[PDB]
RNA sequence: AUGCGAAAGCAGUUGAAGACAAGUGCUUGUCGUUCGUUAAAAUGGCCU
């Protein structure tokens, strides 16, 4: 039992326990009425009406195991429905913030804890965040661009927020799962829905693009193997709901993920087109079939390197001509209309390959001139009229191993009219790196040789995007949803 | 040219701080039941029932006061922990509000009202100790404190009453328990 | 209409009211010019009130009853602050009142003089030849109160310190029921039941202009100057003349009229207008009593006015807290997978014996009954046979035929599988040269491609089986 | 002048109601609709008009809370399985209530509601109530203000009908007596302050089908008192039933007999009776038949005698369903199948 | 709180050639329909006003068909030799019909009594006769005399307008609806002839090269014509005079083609075609006129027509065999006083001020094993799931959404033999297809994990794992080959 | 389950103290206790 109350007569006993229900039951019959779908667990319930009007109500949804994520409710009990549902900005994260702890039931999973469990992982994960050095805090952040809407891929469950009422104002299941007709309890608690790894617009705007993995029950022969889906969702520019127009099972093979998806430019197909990016140098690019009604695969390129890196980034030009595919190591360039090495015919040292001092984790470019490529170790700007590099900037110091290979990428993020952002953190030691952290962020140029600006602040910063009048978007730890501006 | 600020917010700042859950829950309903009021980890919101509505957020990086309690770059510890709708200092002035933190500040501001740049601020002694909870029946209040000399705390049980002079918030210790681990 | 009367203050910004609440009449004060539905109820079923005023330094109103008696009632303090009587039993029925003196006129033709802040009847009063009367106004002689008029039919004018008539202005067939000074010199009448207004100058004692509306008149006021004149008209409408007293101009026309309609075709009428100077005040009633107003710059509105306002006359419930659809704002739309298409990253699309004359005829033209027959067909020496002597562009279209064929009818796999094997054994070549082999091998290449996927976990089973199997029949 | 005349109604008329403060006039019938009137002498307008869509109505009535009286709620029932409240000015505020806490076997439709207050007696606070007709004997009794389930009582036998009587006791305090009626002739009188327990059983003489039951005089929900200073002790009761009876009933000494004697009994009617009623002093008695035009008759208290000279056969009644009288004004307004109410006016009041 | 989620049932990956709405439509045309005659069938028309009948020629036997009853209604038989050919008056009221002797019966429908005219043309037998489309008293009728003559029914003497200009056996002609002047004729000798009536006439204003002596003409478009003609078929344009595709994709020459458009399909427009084989097929003028249904009757069909597109009826397809066989495929289509006591339902709210709605939509079934998943019952759902009549792929969602929600062992604790016995049974039926073989063999893990005491105890258990174990052998060795012939797909790329 | 890594895997990990309970001062257990490290049960299920 989580929560429990009479009302002010006291012959109703609200019960508000782990499993998405509330129970209210009459005493003297022994009886109940209950709500058995409210979207988390019932951390807080209590009456509050001079009379018996209003119940009020604090739901935990425990799905985000990064961050006990609150949402807060005041109920008409004479329909028992909803009045008040005040929400949050509710994303997730590679590990949990400091101090937050899974609730308690009967047992310990990955979402609850046992007693002494709760006692041992506290002090452990105190302890972890006091020691290691891998720490990293960044999350898929995506931006409805024709009406400039904030979307978190919370896992299975896409949420529609924007600052501009300062609300979220959808809240959509896009798994085949275990999304809502359920209670868990201990074992679907051991379970774990399906998770939301990618999610992209179409540039148009009448489009979503979402990969997804989905893992087996625990203990059985096809547990070790995993799933990966993708689905692409129309709507109209007026309603909030998403159809899904075309589902697509296991892309580029079974246990074959796509690791990065890119939207394609207008130019090509009046950006109605993706593509996927696997760990192995695969490269598929899907398309719109509009003669018949679906998305379908077009443009292919299979290499199966018996290696694997969990590193990948790629890049389009303006023009729908020139594709950049960084994988570890090696940059390529490709045309678009052969998917081929582009030859140098006149041999002017434009070589189609670039092979770097790192593995490239992050690929961009700002114009038909500048390209900007992070590795772990170092920023580098190069020229693509002269084949050479810009620019070189020291970054191996400020990221050592506390980032997981492929963050970077969202971390940074370039305005395509004026230039770029970077991003660094660090925490303040006291003579040992303590809980609170520090941020610096240098606004760069499209040359990178000139710091356009640099300011710092204090929370740890977990994501930026650019709203598209040229001014940009950071969100922090705290949801704290902060603006860069001119 | 370029400013970088805090413009939306976010997390709720539930009653975890003192995780022996005397009351989760912190928000209250308006004597005219058309105003909830719900304080954010940043901003205080007043929602309007009858359309759902935020009417308006209340930030606390515009008014220093809320800014020197809440926003101290050094420790987040200063953080509400109650908040009340009737006023200490007169009895039945209305759109007032009274906010407590867990350190001893008691701030008197006027929802649906604008921020004069003087809200009324107060401090509370004796709290070596932290705070945990204030309330009040009629007229009386009680407060409820977190001290030490197990891994538990003590409890101390005090009357607050007001004015033997401005400032000055009268407190006496009503009782005390040493070591308590549910307590509703 | 339910309103039964009704007057501004003077400056229009407060309109006091009087309808009928089940068999009560009650008075409300309302404002115009920026809900205090603080009423006041007639006490007696029975009688009604017959005229109103204001007075304005406290303000108040006065109120004319049948019982013969007058309250002046406070505004803000809900209470008539004094009853004043007279001494009798009849109906009063006009007052009028400027400066502190308070003129009352009954129907048995007596004229009352009051002091208010005597709280006094200064003078009971009658004369010769007024046999019947309803309409009762004094002049703008300063504080001086001479030369009232009287009315029944035939304006009558009056001094009081000798009390005779001296000018009788020849009236209308009706009762006349409105009668307002426009200027030191002019005076207006609307008589009730007629569309002709008589503007008379008083000196000359002659009759200088007539005004016509258009449907039955009810209210009238003036502005500031004679500037203009507004008409509450029976239909429900408003008439606006503006310079009415300039250069047969006898008669004159409404210079502006005003109706006011909502969306859905439905017309509502007005009630006790009020304008002013470039300022123009109307009244309706959104529900049967409650009053609403407009205000609005008369000088820029064009000559005929149909005023348009929001009225709920047919609109559906979109209550708030829902969705457009029975759901609410606190659910999560759950997961409608619809009708969409499903399909994987396999299908590359989009990027001596025998009976070679049959099949190449089938497949240049398309048959499964035939083609069933001549699959049903079996020797493998024949099937060489003929893929040997068949040609390569039909052979192609025969391998995603087959491969198709299987993707169905799975069972029938074997047998086909050795057609497709000596198919694509014989015709090698051609293939090999034409280039989209991936798109044009569609169906058979997804098909393969899927059980190889199944092929591990096959294993699996095999191999526990076997365990199992081994287990119980070792003993 | 005709109220309905304002705007006509498309089918029976089913029920109506005064408002006990504001002059307002709910007519609710088979159309699925709500009309709310503004009553003049002469024109009576149409001051709103809610329409359901796929429900009926068979009661709906006007209720004021009792301790905030600025928030007057409207109750809708059909026979369906729900009751629709509506709050007390563009679009309205229409709630529901549906949801029984375990007792769903008994009420399968709400077609019978009755709607009364309460004092809680530990605290003394007000709240309103709504009594629901069951099965067999289960008057099921929900808490207006909220929606929930608040207690259960059983009459025995087939349910036919009921009704609420009050008391004062002292300063702020009183108690309300359900008073039910099983057909037979079995009359139940509970109380609701304690849970509900049986205070008196009696045997109504003769009445064998027993059909509807009224008191009046005191205050009641037919003329709802404004607050707990201004509640009575009612004095008349009235069984009528069904071959067209009716049997008056003085309380202080049926109660204090417990096996009583009718005070007077009422036959001129003929047919089925529907609709017992009284004026709010209780002077008047109401009752009227449901099965043929021209079957409605007042009665003077406490002589228990007929009136004679009213109606005769030019009074355009027509099959009478429901009988209001309006608290103050003295108005009776009637409705009858044809789908238009009438008003009468009584001068004596 | 929000409602309860359906259970998603499941949906494989797509194979090739789904049935697409073409499809639905044309074989949702079904319940065909057989009757005999005597000899060829050359000829078959629908009337165009009110569409509910048919003609049919035959040899000396015309028939009309009732589109109500599909029988014969009516029969002209006065034909001293065999009649060509029949054709409906575009308002109906009026047939023509050419024999062979060298004349045309023009006399109104359903009357076999009246032979209104009888016009007498040049001797030798006329195959085509037709009425105008954009005149209402101008019919067409040509025989083998190979001149086409134009006959007003007013002036049954002389021939209006006599047209050559044609080669050999003019055996078609047909009018282009926008042009009342305009007519195509289909010479015998291919080059279809396109002539202008209110000139001289003499010669075609043109003419079109198609090589094959081509057999039928209709005008699809103002500006488009279809030329029935040889193995293929062609479709030309008119103002730019050139042909714009052929579809050749039949076995023998093409021989019956008519158009119809407008009417409720989700094709727009309509093309039939008989190909002496059987195979009478639909096209749409919309996709270059693409292949999109079929069908196969035994001899040589050499007529074929639709209902045309006002048909308001059950809608018909006629197909004349020259087996002398007529063949039909079709698709088919309380007390006053109570009610013065409750009249108040019929009234939807027209004129109140505001409406509220809030009756719940009437969800769909709500199955048996969906309830069991509700309320956890899993045991009962497996049983219920394993029930006889239930769709294959209904129960593999059924044990793909018990395996998602991971209760499995939960399901398999209380199972007893003879609650076994059924899941095997099905397990060795689904075994073999291969999302079906994933998860059945995910179960008989587990179930073997479970049982093997039991299954060392009971005989016949053992035998069911043994059929099972041919089986999955058996299977495993077709993925292997199947895996080599995917080997020579990666070869010979 | 830690770290590293690909969806594979490679290494690494399971410490004490305190306390209390049961058992005959001793045996087992337990922890709303500490520091130290990279560390299966209470017949009991989802509204209209």
Redesign the pocket.
């Known amino acids: 039992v989580l929560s429990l109350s009479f009302s002010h007569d006291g012959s109703y006993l609200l019960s508000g326990g782990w499993?998405?229900?509330m129970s209210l039951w009459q005493l003297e019959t022994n009886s109940q009425?209950?709500?058995?779908?409210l979207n988390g667990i019932i951390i807080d319930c209590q009456v509050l009406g001079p009379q018996g009007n209003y119940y009020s109500l604090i739901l935990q949804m425990t799905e985000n195991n990064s961050n006990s994520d609150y949402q807060f409710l005041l109920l008409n009990a004479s329909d028992?429905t909803s009045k008040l549902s005040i929400n949050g900005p509710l994303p997730v994260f590679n590990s949990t913030i400091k101090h937050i702890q899974q609730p308690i039931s009967?047992?310990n999973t990955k979402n609850s804890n046992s007693?002494?469990s709760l006692?041992?992982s506290k002090?452990?994960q105190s302890?972890?965040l006091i020691?290691?050095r891998?720490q990293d805090f960044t999350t898929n952040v995506e931006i409805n661009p024709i009406n400039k809407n904030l979307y978190f891929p919370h896992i299975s469950a896409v949420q529609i927020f924007d600052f501009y009422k300062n609300e979220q104002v959808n809240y959509q299941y896009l798994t085949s799962g275990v999304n809502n007709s359920?209670?868990?309890?201990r074992f679907?608690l051991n379970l774990q829905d399906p998770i939301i790894t990618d999610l992209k617009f179409t540039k148009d705007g009448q489009w979503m693009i979402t990969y997804e993995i989905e893992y087996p029950p625990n203990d059985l022969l096809s547990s070790?193997?995993?799933t990966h889906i993708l689905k692409f969702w129309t709507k109209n520019d007026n309603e909030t709901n998403w159809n899904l127009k075309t589902k697509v099972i296991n892309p580029h093979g079974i246990?074959?993920?796509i690791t990065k998806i890119l939207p394609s430019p207008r130019s090509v197909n009046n950006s109605q087109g993706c593509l996927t990016a696997?760990?192995?140098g695969g490269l598929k690019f899907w398309s719109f079939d509009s003669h018949e009604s679906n998305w379908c695969l077009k443009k292919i390129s299979l290499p199966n390197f018996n290696h694997?890196?969990?590193?990948v980034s790629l890049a389009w030009s303006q023009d729908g001509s020139l594709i950049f595919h960084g994988f570890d190591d090696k940059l390529q360039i490709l045309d678009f209309d052969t998917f081929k090495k582009f030859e140098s015919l006149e041999n002017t040292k434009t070589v189609s390959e670039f092979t770097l001092d790192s593995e490239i984790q992050t690929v961009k470019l700002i114009n038909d001139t500048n390209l900007i490529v992070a590795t772990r170790t170092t920023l580098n700007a190069i020229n693509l009229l002269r084949g050479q590099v810009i620019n070189s900037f020291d970054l191996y110091p400020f990221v050592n191993?506390v980032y997981?290979?492929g963050h970077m990428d969202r971390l940074i993020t370039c305005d395509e009219r004026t230039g770029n952002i970077a991003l660094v953190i660090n925490q303040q030691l006291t003579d040992v790196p303590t809980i609170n952290y520090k941020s610096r962020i240098i606004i760069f140029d499209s040359d990178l040789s000139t710091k356009l600006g640099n300011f710092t602040h204090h929370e740890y910063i977990s994501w930026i995007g650019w709203n598209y009048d040229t001014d940009f978007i950071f969100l922090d730890i705290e949801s704290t949803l902060g603006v860069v501006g001119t | 040219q370029y400013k970088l600020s805090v413009v939306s917010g976010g997390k709720p700042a539930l009653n975890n701080l003192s995780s022996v859950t005397g009351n989760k829950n912190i928000a209250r309903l308006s004597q005219d039941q058309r105003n909830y009021i719900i304080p954010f980890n940043n901003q205080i919101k007043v929602y309007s029932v009858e359309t759902r509505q935020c009417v308006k957020t209340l930030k606390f990086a515009n008014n220093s006061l809320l800014s020197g309690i809440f926003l101290q770059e050094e420790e987040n510890n200063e953080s509400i922990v109650k908040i009340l709708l009737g006023d200490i200092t007169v009895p039945q002035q209305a759109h007032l509000i009274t906010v407590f933190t867990n350190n001893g500040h008691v701030i008197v501001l006027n929802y649906k009202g604008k921020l004069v740049e003087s809200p009324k601020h107060f401090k509370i002694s004796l709290a070596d100790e932290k705070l945990a909870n204030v309330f009040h029946s009629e007229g009386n209040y009680r407060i409820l404190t977190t001290f030490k000399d197990?891994?538990?705390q003590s409890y101390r049980l005090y009357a607050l009453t007001f004015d033997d002079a401005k400032k000055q918030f009268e407190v006496a210790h009503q009782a005390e328990w040493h070591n308590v681990?549910?307590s509703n | 209409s339910p309103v039964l009367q009704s007057a501004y203050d003077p400056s229009g910004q407060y309109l006091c009211y009087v309808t009928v609440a089940l068999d009560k009449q009650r008075v409300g004060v309302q404002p115009t010019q920026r809900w205090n539905e603080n009423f006041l109820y007639l006490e007696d079923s029975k009688l009604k009130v017959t005229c109103l005023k204001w007075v304005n330094d406290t303000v108040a109103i006065i109120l004319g009853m049948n019982n013969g008696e007058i309250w002046l009632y406070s505004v803000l303090a809900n209470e008539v602050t004094y009853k004043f009587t007279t001494g009798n039993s009849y109906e009063i029925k006009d007052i009028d009142l400027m400066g502190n003196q308070l003129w009352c006129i009954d129907s048995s033709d007596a004229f009352y003089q009051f002091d208010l802040l005597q709280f006094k009847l200064l003078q009971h009063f009658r004369i010769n030849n007024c046999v019947q009367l309803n309409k009762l106004t004094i002049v703008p002689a300063g504080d001086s109160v001479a030369q009232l008029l009287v009315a029944s039919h035939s304006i009558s004018l009056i001094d009081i310190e000798e009390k005779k008539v001296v000018m009788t202005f020849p009236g209308h067939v009706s009762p006349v029921s409105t009668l307002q000074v426009i200027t030191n010199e002019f005076f207006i009448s609307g008589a009730e039941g007629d569309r002709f207004l008589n503007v008379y100058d008083i000196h000359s004692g002659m009759t200088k202009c007539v005004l016509v509306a258009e449907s039955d008149i009810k209210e009238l006021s003036h502005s500031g100057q004679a500037d203009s004149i507004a008409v509450t008209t029976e239909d429900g409408s408003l008439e606006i003349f503006v310079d009415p007293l300039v250069s047969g101009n006898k008669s004159k026309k409404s210079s502006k009229k005003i109706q006011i309609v909502s969306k859905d075709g439905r017309k509502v009428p007005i009630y006790n207008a009020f304008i002013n100077k470039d300022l123009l005040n109307v009244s309706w009633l959104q529900n049967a009593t409650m009053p609403y107003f407009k205000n609005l710059q008369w000088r820029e509105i064009p000559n005929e006015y149909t005023v348009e306002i929001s009225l709920n006359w047919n609109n559906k419930n979109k209550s708030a807290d829902r969705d457009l659809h029975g759901k609410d704002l606190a659910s999560a739309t759950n997961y409608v997978e619809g009708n969409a298409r499903v399909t994987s990253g396999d299908n590359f699309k989009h990027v001596t014996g025998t009976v070679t004359v049959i099949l190449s005829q089938a497949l240049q033209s398309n048959d499964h009954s035939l083609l069933e027959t001549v699959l049903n067909n079996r020797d493998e020496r024949v099937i060489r046979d003929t893929i040997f002597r068949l040609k390569p562009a039909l052979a192609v279209i025969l391998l995603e035929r087959l491969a198709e064929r299987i993707a169905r009818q799975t069972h029938r796999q074997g047998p086909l599988n050795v057609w497709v094997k000596w198919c694509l054994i014989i015709h090698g070549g051609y293939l090999v040269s034409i280039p989209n082999l991936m798109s044009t091998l569609s169906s058979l290449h997804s098909t393969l491609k899927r059980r190889s996927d199944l092929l591990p976990r096959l294993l699996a089973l095999d191999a526990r089986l076997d365990c199992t199997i081994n287990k119980f029949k070792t003993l | 002048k005709d109220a309905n005349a304002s705007h006509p109604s498309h089918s029976a008329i089913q029920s109506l109601s005064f408002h006990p403060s504001k002059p307002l006039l709910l007519t609710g019938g088979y159309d699925k609709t709500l009309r709310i009137y503004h009553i003049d002498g002469k024109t009576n307008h149409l001051v709103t008009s809610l329409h359901l869509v796929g429900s009926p109505i068979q009661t709906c009535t006007f209720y004021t809370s009792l301790s905030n009286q600025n928030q007057q709620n409207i109750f809708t029932a059909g026979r369906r399985?729900?009751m629709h409240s509506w709050d007390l000015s563009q679009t309205a505020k229409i709630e529901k209530f549906?949801?029984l806490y375990g007792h769903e076997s008994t009420q399968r439709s709400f077609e019978n509601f009755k709607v009364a207050h309460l004092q809680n007696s530990q605290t003394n606070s007000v709240h309103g109530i709504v009594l629901l007709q069951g099965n067999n004997g289960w008057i099921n009794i929900l808490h207006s203000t909220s929606g929930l389930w608040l207690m259960g009582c059983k009459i025995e036998g087939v349910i036919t009908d009921f009704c609420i009587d009050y008391q004062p006791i002292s300063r702020g305090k009183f108690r309300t007596i359900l008073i039910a009626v099983n057909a037979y002739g079995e009359v139940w009188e509970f109380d609701l302050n304690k849970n509900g327990h049986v205070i008196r059983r009696w045997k109504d003489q003769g009445g064998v089908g027993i059909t509807k039951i009224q008191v009046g005089g005191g205050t009641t929900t037919t003329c709802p008192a404004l607050q707990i200073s201004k509640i009575k002790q009612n004095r008349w009761l009235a069984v009528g039933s069904e071959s067209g009876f009716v049997n008056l009933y003085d309380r202080n000494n049926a109660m204090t007999s417990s096996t009583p004697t009718p005070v007077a009994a009422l036959d001129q009617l003929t047919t089925t009776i529907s609709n017992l009623q009284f004026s709010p002093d209780g002077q008047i008695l109401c009752m009227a038949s449901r099965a043929v035009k021209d079957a409605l008759r007042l009665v003077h208290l406490p002589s228990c005698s007929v009136f004679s000279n009213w109606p005769t056969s030019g009074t355009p009644l027509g099959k009478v369903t429901s009988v209001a009288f309006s608290p103050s004004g003295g108005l009776l307004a009637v409705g009858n199948e044809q789908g238009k109410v009438r008003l009468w006016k009584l001068n004596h009041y | 709180?929000t409602?309860?989620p359906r259970i998603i049932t499941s949906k494989a990956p797509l194979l090739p050639q789904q049935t697409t709405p073409e499809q639905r439509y044309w074989r949702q045309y079904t319940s065909a329909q057989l009757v005999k005659e005597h000899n060829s069938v050359t000829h078959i028309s629908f009337n165009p006003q009110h569409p509910h009948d048919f003609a049919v020629t035959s040899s000396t036997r015309v028939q009309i068909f009732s589109s109500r009853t599909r029988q014969v209604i009516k029969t002209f038989s006065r034909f001293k030799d065999v009649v060509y050919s029949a054709s409906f008056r575009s308002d109906g009221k009026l047939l023509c019909a050419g024999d062979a002797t060298g004349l045309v019966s023009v006399y109104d429908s359903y009357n076999p009594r009246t032979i209104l005219l009888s016009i007498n043309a040049s001797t030798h037998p006329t195959h085509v006769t037709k009425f105008h489309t954009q005149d209402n008293k101008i019919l067409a009728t040509a025989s083998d005399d190979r001149v086409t003559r134009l006959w007003d029914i007013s002036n049954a003497y002389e021939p209006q307008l006599e047209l050559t200009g044609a080669t050999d056996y003019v055996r078609t002609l047909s009018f282009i609806p926008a042009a009342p002047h305009l007519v195509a004729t289909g010479s015998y000798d291919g080059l279809i002839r396109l002539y202008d009536t209110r000139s001289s006439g003499s010669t075609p204003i043109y003419s079109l090269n198609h090589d094959q002596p081509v057999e039928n003409v209709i005008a699809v478009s103002p500006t488009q014509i279809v030329s029935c003609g040889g193995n293929n078929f062609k479709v030309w344009d008119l103002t730019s005079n050139k042909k714009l595709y052929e579809r050749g994709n039949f076995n023998k020459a093409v021989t019956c083609l008519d158009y119809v458009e407008n009417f409720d399909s989700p094709m727009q427009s309509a093309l039939i075609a008989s190909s002496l084989d059987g195979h009478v097929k639909v096209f749409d003028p919309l996709d270059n006129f693409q292949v999109k249904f079929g069908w196969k009757f035994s001899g040589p069909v050499l007529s074929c027509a639709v209902s045309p597109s006002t048909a308001q009826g059950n809608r018909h397809l006629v197909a004349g065999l020259s087996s002398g066989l007529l063949a039909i495929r079709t698709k088919k289509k309380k007390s006053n006083n109570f009610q013065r006591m409750m009249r108040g339902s019929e009234y939807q709210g027209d004129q109140e001020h505001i409406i509220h709605n809030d009756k719940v939509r009437s969800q769909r079934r709500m199955r048996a094993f969906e309830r069991n998943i509700?309320?956890?019952k899993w045991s009962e759902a497996l049983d219920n799931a394993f029930v006889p009549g239930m769709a294959k792929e209904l129960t593999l969602t059924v044990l793909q959404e018990l395996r998602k929600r991971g209760k499995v062992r939960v399901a398999l604790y209380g199972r007893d033999e003879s609650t076994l016995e059924p899941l095997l049974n099905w397990c060795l039926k689904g075994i073999e297809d291969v999302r079906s073989a994933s998860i059945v063999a995910d179960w008989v893990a587990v179930v073997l994990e479970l049982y093997g005491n039991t299954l060392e105890s009971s005989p016949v258990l053992q035998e069911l794992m043994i059929d099972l174990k041919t089986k999955v052998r058996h299977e495993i060795h077709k993925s292997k080959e199947a895996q080599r012939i995917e080997g020579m797909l990666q070869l010979l790329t």
Do not use: C, W
């Open positions: 499993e998405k229900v009425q209950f709500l058995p779908r028992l009967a047992m007693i002494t006692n041992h002090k452990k302890r972890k020691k290691s891998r359920m209670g868990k309890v679907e070790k193997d995993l246990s074959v993920p696997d760990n192995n694997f890196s969990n590193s191993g997981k290979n | 197990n891994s538990l681990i549910l | 399985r729900y549906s949801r | 709180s409602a309860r509700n309320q956890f």
